[PDB]
Structure formats: structure tokens, C-alpha cells
Design a protein around this ligand. Structure first.
Ligand SMILES: CC(C)(C)S(=O)(=O)N[C@@H](Cc1ccccc1)C(=O)N[C@@H](Cc1c[nH]c[nH+]1)C(=O)N[C@@H](CC1CCCCC1)C(O)(O)C(F)(F)C(=O)NCCN1CCOCC1
Length: 329
């Protein structure tokens, strides 16, 4: 089997992407944030504290296939400090025509303020390794782990657009969606992430420096977070850019034409166009814009977030020994 779903940016900044997911029988359609940085599928629901709901909710009691997973609970917090918790049902879940029976659907009893305030995200679908799932006492498998037995090939691909829709495919590689060939690189699963090592970087039309950069491929993070000295090297080429303590990172004049940024995948090179690094104005009508490449020093891990992934066709190869593939597009 295979599945193919359109994913759409939630706003004009590409802050996040949402993908429709059908849950239950008859299907309830929710728009979820596919996150390769976590492993929980959780949704707003009829159980969520009413004052914290502003979103489309899942109602397990209107699904004939929903089953309560007795005595299971979950609690998660994310790197930006947001959190949620609740109980667990199993139910039928379909993405793009690909159906999984018996999927753990984590129902939120409580959600943090950030979740309440974002009307466009009805929940998260985690696509990291199942060791990071937060259900207790027995962890639950991710949608991808449950689908692998049925998939034509144990892969999914991410084709995120720049201020445009893109596609998540399950079970096949669309050879029309990229150019050249795919280069694969080893994944370390020790921390539960799609963790890989980039072979170097270049800024604009300058030299490529071979330097290993360990980081994670994370669809659920907006920006590109890299070591402080790499990031300083990038913004040194932008005459009006400065690190702003009040805004929380590097800012630059919106009128600037930004240099591209290249990262290494083995012997291959992926080029992020300068325009992708212009995240946007710090506020409407401002003359100052926020940068899309920022320092990872405060995070503790380098993150190849949407700014980087949307410049590439990305293959998450879910075989027993996983790998990550990148192609230009
Ligand atoms: C709107 C920025 C002004 C560009 S922002 O950073 O706030 N954007 C958020 C994403 C966003 C967009 C739109 C609406 C809401 C949220 C962002 O990029 N968040 C990152 C920031 C980060 C990472 N690390 C340090 N800081 C993040 O937490 N991403 C997580 C998924 C997000 C969470 C908020 C809602 C959207 C999905 C994440 O899962 O990708 C993660 F990998 F970073 C992470 O937190 N992984 C959680 C690991 N769990 C921990 C518990 O044990 C199990 C493993």
C-alpha cells in the first residue's frame, strides 16, 4: 500500500505545515503537524478542558472503532516549552489513503497556552522513533511503524514547499519530484531522532568547509539551528545583520539580498536559496527581518528544520538500519 497527502503552511511565514488526517469510523478529519522530532500522535478532543479549546476536536464516542487503552496515560513537553497530557484510545487512522487499524490516538485532557492560541493545528503526528513515545506503562508505535508491514517500501518522503503546498508520501519515492539523484547518509537512533552528520557548509559563493555537524532532521521545527561559529560566518556576509538580544536572534534589513547557504550530505551539496533564509519581518511594516539561520547553542542540538528541509526532497528510510536521503529539487 501507499499514501500521498498534501501539506500546507499554516501562515505566510511557513511557520509550520499541516496535513489532513482521518481518524475513526466514520472519519473525523483533523489537521495535524507531522513532526519527525517526536513520536506521539495526539489530538484535541472532546476530553480537552473546554477553556483550553479555541481547533477541530476528535470525539472518540462517535467513532465505532475507537477503543480505550485501559490504564494508559501520556504526558509530553516540547523544546519550546509547550506541553499536553491525557489518555489513549486505539482507532483507525488514515493519511492520504493509507489506513492503519489499531493506531494509538492520544487524547488531550489538557493543553498548554501555545496550543490553545494556535487555531490552525489540531494536534501532532510524530514520526521520530518509537522509543520517544510518551505513553505509559507501555509505549505505543508511531503511525509509520504500524504502517511498515503494509507499505510497498518502508519509506516516507517529505517535499515541503516554500510559501506553497507540498507533499508527504508513504511507501514510494516519486522520481518526478526531485532532480538528479538521492544521496543517502547514515542515521543514528541512539537518541530516538533522525540524527545524522552533515559533512560541511559553504556561505554563498565561498568555500566549502569540511566540518562534521551532528544534527536532526526535524519537520516540526521552523528554523535552521547550527553551531554558533557557523551561524556567525553566515551573518558576517550580510552588511546590516546583527544579533538582537531583545528579539532573540539575528536580524537584518528586509531589503537585503541574502546569500545562499550550502550544507553537505556525503559528497553531495544541498543549496538553500537566500530568500528562504528571510523568515520575515519582525512585525508587520517593520524594516527589520528575522533570520532563518540561528545559533543552536541554547538548544543543545543542531536542528535541520523547515528552512533547510524545504530546499530538498527528503527520504526517511525506515528499514531495519535506517538512513536519510536528500535530493535537490
Ligand atoms: C513560531 C519559531 C518564533 C519559528 S518557534 O520555535 O516557536 N516555532 C516552533 C514551531 C511552531 C510553529 C507554529 C505553531 C507552533 C509551533 C518550533 O520550531 N518549535 C521547536 C523549537 C525547539 C526545538 N528544540 C528547541 N526548541 C520545537 O519544539 N519543535 C518540536 C515540535 C513542535 C512543538 C510545538 C508545536 C509544533 C511542533 C519538536 O518535536 O520537533 C522537537 F523535536 F523539537 C521536540 O521538542 N522534540 C520533543 C522530544 N520529546 C521530548 C519528550 O520526550 C520524548 C521526546
Amino acid at each position: 500500500s501507499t499514501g500521498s497527502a498534501t501539506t500546507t503552511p499554516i501562515d505566510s511565514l511557513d511557520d509550520a505545515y499541516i496535513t489532513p488526517v482521518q481518524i475513526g469510523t466514520p472519519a473525523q478529519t483533523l489537521n495535524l503537524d507531522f513532526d519527525t522530532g517526536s513520536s506521539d500522535l495526539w489530538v484535541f478532543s472532546s476530553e480537552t478542558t473546554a477553556s483550553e479549546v479555541x481547533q477541530t476536536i476528535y470525539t472518540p464516542s462517535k467513532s465505532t472503532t475507537a477503543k480505550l487503552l485501559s490504564g494508559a496515560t501520556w504526558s509530553i513537553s516540547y523544546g519550546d516549552g509547550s506541553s499536553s497530557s491525557g489518555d489513549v484510545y486505539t482507532d483507525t487512522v488514515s493519511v492520504g489513503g493509507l489506513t492503519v487499524t489499531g493506531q494509538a490516538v492520544e487524547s488531550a485532557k489538557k493543553v498548554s497556552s501555545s496550543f490553545t492560541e494556535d487555531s490552525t493545528i489540531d494536534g501532532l503526528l510524530g514520526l521520530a522513533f518509537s522509543t520517544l513515545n510518551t505513553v505509559s506503562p507501555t509505549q505505543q508505535k508511531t503511525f509509520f511503524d504500524n504502517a511498515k508491514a503494509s507499505l510497498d517500501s518502508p519509506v516516507f518522503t517529505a517535499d515541503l514547499g516554500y510559501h506553497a503546498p507540498g507533499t508527504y508520501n508513504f511507501g514510494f519515492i516519486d522520481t518526478t519530484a526531485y532532480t538528479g539523484s538521492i544521496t543517502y547518509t547514515a542515521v543514528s537512533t541512539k537518541q530516538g531522532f533522525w540524527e545524522w552528520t552533515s559533512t560541511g557548509y559553504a556561505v554563498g559563493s565561498g568555500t566549502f568547509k569540511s566540518t562534521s555537524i551532528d544534527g536532526i532532521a526535524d519537520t516540526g521545527t521552523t528554523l535552521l539551528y547550527l553551531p554558533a561559529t557557523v551561524v556567525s560566518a553566515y551573518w558576517a556576509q550580510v552588511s546590516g545583520a546583527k544579533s538582537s538580544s531583545s528579539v532573540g536572534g539575528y536580524v537584518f534589513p528586509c531589503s537585503a539580498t541574502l546569500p545562499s547557504f550550502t550544507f553537505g550530505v556525503g559528497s553531495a551539496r544541498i543549496v538553500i536559496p537566500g530568500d528562504y533564509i528571510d523568515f520575515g519581518p519582525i512585525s508587520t511594516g517593520s524594516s527589520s527581518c528575522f533570520g532563518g539561520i540561528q545559533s543552536s547553542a541554547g538548544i543543545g542540538i543542531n536542528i535541520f528544520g523547515d528552512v533547510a528541509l524545504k530546499a530538498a526532497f527528503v527520504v526517511f528510510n525506515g528499514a531495519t538500519t535506517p538512513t536519510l536521503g536528500f535530493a535537490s529539487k
